[PDB]
């Protein structure tokens, strides 16, 4: 597992997660004294290679609650009318352990917007979890269960999912700023070696906002341009080499001279 020292890149988002998670669990008395509501689960959208899933493995390392996972499309099933059974037999396993976070990495396979010409069992099992979150017995389930889901682009989905009453926050994980991009180098570099007379902010400012995970690719690749030569240690010019390269090909097919317009 990984931890919060490694998810650097931000604090405003993560400082909003345990605004809903850690407080009701440890300290609902003020929130019962204030006695207003109970804010339930959360969604976090952003482009890929940004740290969505990363925050969700860390949090389990720093939760004290039980943390249930479902990966991509292990609920859609062959026979009929048991996908729902695979759902309602989930939450009942949660309420056994009253503090219970769940997690589902992606929903765009399940929770896509509905139609009639096609889309069968999947548009049904969505139509009962949507019940379980905020129904009669869902009010019972609504006590202590919390939910996290991590899409990529949310316009696809229904509103009913991200409708409040059950999704009270909709977090953005955008691609970072210079200093955010600059630090996570160190978070993927400190293992490396006594890097020799080096700067790393002068190179981040070269590479404008592309993504985060790409930065894990330049650092691992930079050592590899030093690994071939039995040069265990690390260079400067190997960095602005690689980052100047691996995004070139990403800027290779973007060109087009159709130009039926201006």
């Amino acid at each position: 597992d990984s931890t919060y020292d490694m998810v650097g890149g931000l604090t405003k988002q993560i400082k909003e997660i345990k605004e809903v998670i850690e407080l009701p669990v440890k300290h609902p008395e003020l929130f019962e004294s204030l006695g207003i509501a109970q804010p339930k689960g959360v969604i976090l959208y952003g482009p890929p290679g940004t740290g969505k899933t990363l925050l969700a493995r860390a949090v389990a390392h720093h939760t004290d609650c039980k943390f249930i996972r479902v990966s991509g499309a292990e609920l859609v099933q062959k026979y009929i009318g048991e996908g729902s059974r695979m759902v309602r037999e989930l939450f009942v396993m949660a309420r056994e352990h009253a503090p219970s976070i769940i997690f589902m990495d992606e929903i765009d396979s399940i929770g896509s917007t509905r139609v009639e010409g096609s889309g069968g069992g999947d548009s049904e099992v969505q139509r009962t979890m949507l019940e379980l979150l905020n129904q009669l017995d869902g009010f019972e389930t609504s006590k202590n269960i919390k939910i996290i889901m991590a899409t990529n682009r949310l316009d696809i989905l229904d509103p009913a999912l991200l409708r409040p009453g059950r999704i009270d926050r909709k977090i953005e994980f955008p691609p970072p700023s210079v200093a955010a991009r600059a630090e996570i180098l160190r978070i993927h570099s400190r293992k490396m070696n006594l890097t020799r007379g080096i700067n790393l902010r002068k190179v981040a400012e070269k590479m404008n906002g592309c993504s985060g995970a790409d930065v894990k690719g330049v650092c691992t690749e930079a050592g590899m341009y030093a690994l071939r030569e039995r040069r265990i240690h690390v260079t400067q010019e190997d960095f602005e080499l690689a980052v100047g390269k691996v995004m070139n090909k990403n800027q290779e097919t973007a060109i087009s001279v159709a130009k039926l317009f201006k």
Binding site: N208, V257, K259, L260, F261, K262
Partner: protein
């Protein structure tokens, strides 16, 4: 059954989905900016492409001309844009030879817009997808600045923009504008926006062109100045990109 295959059909929700599908076309186009201020009007531009082996140097694309008074800025399709200006350049002269004086700018756009309405209903024909800017000077209203829309409705603005990502550029203009600017407050303003909401980090002199109207004719009517490259590569370095 959805209501888009022809532009002669209202929707049951009360709207004409084809026309919205034209007003979105300009989003593909290139930026255009105009500012109205004391001494005279200014305009800007940004070419959609800035490659090597094609000269955008002497060949203006975004800034045509309609008369020594009036000049415009253009967006959208190119084949459905020339014929408009090649109509406007006629209607003005056909207002001059009959009335022996110049054009009021309001009549032109009023006559140039209501034909785009003509290509909205009567016939199964395309509406001309174009978003002109109009810049010029008439005596009954002084300086002027209008804007078009391929529906056929116009608006008399102070300083606006169109094209790619204008919605952000307006936010970079709404709050950092002052009516008492002379010229160069609008320039470093204008060129600062395009620097912010571009596609790539070049900002080369070829990528953009400017223009001006000025009442500097001392009791003469008006002058124009469509800047060659040597007048605009020297000013941005003289302004601090």
């Amino acid at each position: 059954r959805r209501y888009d295959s022809r532009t002669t059909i209202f929707s049951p929700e009360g709207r004409l989905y084809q026309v919205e599908y034209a007003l979105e076309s300009i989003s593909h186009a290139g930026t255009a900016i105009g500012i109205m201020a004391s001494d005279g009007i200014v305009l800007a531009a940004e070419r959609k492409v800035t490659s090597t082996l094609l000269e955008q140097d002497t060949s203006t694309e975004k800034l045509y001309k309609l008369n020594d008074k009036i000049a415009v800025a253009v967006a959208g399709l190119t084949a459905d844009a020339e014929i408009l200006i090649n109509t406007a350049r006629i209607h003005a002269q056909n207002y001059l030879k009959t009335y022996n004086e110049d054009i009021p700018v309001e009549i032109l756009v009023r006559r140039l817009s209501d034909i785009k309405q003509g290509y909205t209903q009567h016939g199964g024909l395309r509406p001309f997808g174009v978003s002109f800017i109009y810049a010029g000077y008439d005596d009954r209203y002084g300086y002027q600045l209008y804007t078009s829309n391929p529906s056929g409705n116009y608006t008399g603005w102070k300083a606006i923009s169109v094209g790619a990502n204008t919605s952000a550029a307006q936010t970079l203009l709404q709050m950092d504008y002052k009516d008492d600017m002379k010229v160069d407050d609008a320039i470093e303003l204008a060129l600062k926006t395009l620097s912010k909401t571009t596609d790539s980090s070049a900002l080369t002199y070829d990528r953009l062109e400017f223009a001006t109207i000025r009442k500097g004719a001392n009791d003469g009517e008006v002058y124009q100045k469509i800047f060659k490259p040597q007048e605009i590569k020297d000013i941005l370095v003289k302004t601090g990109i």
